[PDB]
Amino acid sequence: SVLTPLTEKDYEGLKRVLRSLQAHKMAWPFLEPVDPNDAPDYYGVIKEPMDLATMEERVQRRYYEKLTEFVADMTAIFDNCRYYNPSDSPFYQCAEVLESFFVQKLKGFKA
């Protein structure tokens, strides 16, 4: 079922997934919230920002009820980056690579 909440042990597996992403060589743009010194109009454009540090805090605080909610935050990190950045940018590239890695790791967690 997808309505089934995460258990305490499931939370250790999500942490492993989140940490595998933070260790990936293409994760550099997403480790921390976008710095306005690097992208002065970013928060004028992206109204629902997310980053890997924010997800880590939310995993530590047990913010997520269901795996679908965790997946929604993750997918926003990538969809925001493609919405903001042009398709030929290094950022957009990181988002394509890291999203496929996340799908491979998410299939592993689900079964």
Binding site: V34, D38, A39, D41, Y42, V45, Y84, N85, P86, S87, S89, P90, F91
Partner: peptide, 8 residues
């Protein structure tokens, strides 16, 4: 590259 919002 520096981050800037796409226009196309």
């Amino acid at each position: 590259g520096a981050k800037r919002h796409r226009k196309v």
